[PDB]
Nucleic acid binder design. Structure first.
Lengths: 216, 215
DNA sequence: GCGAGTGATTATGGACGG
DNA sequence: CCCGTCCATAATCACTCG
């Protein structure tokens, strides 16, 4: 069972650098080329470079020379990549994969990705805001919602009624609203008769708050 | 030395055939006769998975409805009959010389049209004294994805200071959903009375208006 | 002796032309 | 004749196996 396990999410400051890893297991590390691929938010896959742990032989996409440096520790079957002089453009999910041979000639096994985020911003808890209809529209089902903003960093645990409501729910991708992110969720007659509140939690800020959507 | 893929988005109806195109600026065959051209699929949230290698060899664990073909500078990936599970981005890739990925082609399931079920929301009391005031408009469940949204303050158009987020085509109903937020200051929001949201969808040349006033 | 059989990816050997 | 760039790419090749 080939498996490639990469390190966890990371946050660095403009100008700082980062070193991430990819632990391999299930095959003979020194006989295959390990590749690294980058993918910025909403953009496409971009090849970075490759290394042969067997002899440290490497090769980089012209665009990443000097930006990315790869190494491999044999006794631990682990591959590393270090990015220097980070910038906004270095923000993305980074993958490692195994170039297979014999039964297939391609990248057959992939790591899970290592999200890297570059910014000089700081850690801040969300400001969940309750949102209910203002009563002016032609209406058997009403759509109400929850707003989350000015928070950093990703991600946010947004659930409806501690995990009870799943359908009629639309949680949106946190967009960047000035150094901090902001997201939103809209849930879709049993209200306000019964209780339907917003359950938002922020691992990073180490906070968990609920905003009960009460009419106007 | 690039790999260009077409189209940038392919809409196909379930059960029907989908066909993505990948072209090289030049002949990509390796000096050994082999053509290391591959296709990969990446579904939202997941990691890319291998579909085909060396032009047409199907990778184990890969559905038979996937076939690949081509030579020199033209290569094709085909989904005999698209399944609702097949949505995601497909990428061709040159694995020889200096490896390179195609730009990728997003697969969308071609479904019947639908109009934006809109619902606007007034800034929460909590936010008001807390700095600014955010008006929100949800345009849930619609198709196709191509839509636009304008904001109006007292009938006047407000295009500066908004923020939208879209959601990938839902895999069950095959519709999209977006959200627009209007961040006006607190003193500003108080200076006006009317707030509206309109969406122009190909359904008809007639917008869908939803609004509220501070009373 | 000579015709079938056999390897691969993660770059290069050859043709200009200064 | 040395060397840096550009150039197009199929194992129809080079070579060990019976």
């Amino acid at each position: 069972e080939v498996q490639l396990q990469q390190s966890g999410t990371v946050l660095a400051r403009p100008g700082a650098s980062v070193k991430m890893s990819c632990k391999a297991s299930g095959y003979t590390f020194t006989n295959y080329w390990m590749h690294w691929i980058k993918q910025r938010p909403g953009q496409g896959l971009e090849w970075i470079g490759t290394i042969y742990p067997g002899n440290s032989d490497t090769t980089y996409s012209q665009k990443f020379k000097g930006k990315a440096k790869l190494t491999a520790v044999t006794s631990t079957s682990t591959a590393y990549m270090e990015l220097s002089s980070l910038t906004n453009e270095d923000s993305a999910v980074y993958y490692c994969s195994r170039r297979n041979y014999g039964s297939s000639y391609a990248m057959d096994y992939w790591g899970q990705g290592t999200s890297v985020t570059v910014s000089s911003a700081k850690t801040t808890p969300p400001s969940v805001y309750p949102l209910a209809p203002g009563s002016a529209a032609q209406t058997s089902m009403v759509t109400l919602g929850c707003l989350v903003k000015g928070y950093f960093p990703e991600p946010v645990t947004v659930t409806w009624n501690s995990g009870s409501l799943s359908s009629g729910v639309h949680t949106f991708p946190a967009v960047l609203q000035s150094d901090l992110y902001t997201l939103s969720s809209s849930v879709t007659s049993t209200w306000p008769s019964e209780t339907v509140t917003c359950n938002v939690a922020h691992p990073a800020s180490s906070t968990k708050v609920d905003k009960k959507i009460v009419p106007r | 030395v690039l790999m260009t893929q077409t189209p940038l988005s392919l809409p196909v109806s379930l059960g029907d055939q989908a066909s993505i195109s990948c072209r090289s600026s030049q002949n990509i065959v390796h000096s050994n006769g082999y053509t290391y051209l591959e296709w990969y699929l990446q579904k939202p949230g997941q990691s890319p998975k291998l579909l085909i290698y060396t032009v047409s060899n199907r990778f184990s664990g890969v559905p038979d409805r996937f076939s690949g073909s081509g030579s020199g500078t033209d290569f094709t990936l085909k989904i005999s009959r698209v399944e609702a599970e097949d949505l995601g981005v497909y990428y061709c890739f040159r694995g020889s010389h200096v490896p390179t990925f195609g730009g990728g082609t997003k697969l969308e399931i071609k479904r019947a049209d639908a109009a934006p079920t809109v619902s606007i929301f007034p800034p929460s009391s909590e936010q008001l004294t807390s700095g600014g005031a955010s008006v929100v408009c949800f345009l849930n469940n619609f198709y196709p994805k191509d839509i636009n949204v304008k904001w109006k303050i007292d009938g006047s158009e407000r295009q500066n200071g908004v923020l939208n987020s879209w959601t990938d085509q839902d895999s069950k109903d095959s519709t999209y959903s977006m959200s627009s937020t209007l961040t006006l200051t607190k003193d500003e929001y108080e200076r006006h009375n009317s707030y509206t949201c309109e969406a122009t969808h190909k359904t008809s040349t007639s917008p869908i208006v939803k609004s509220f006033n501070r009373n």
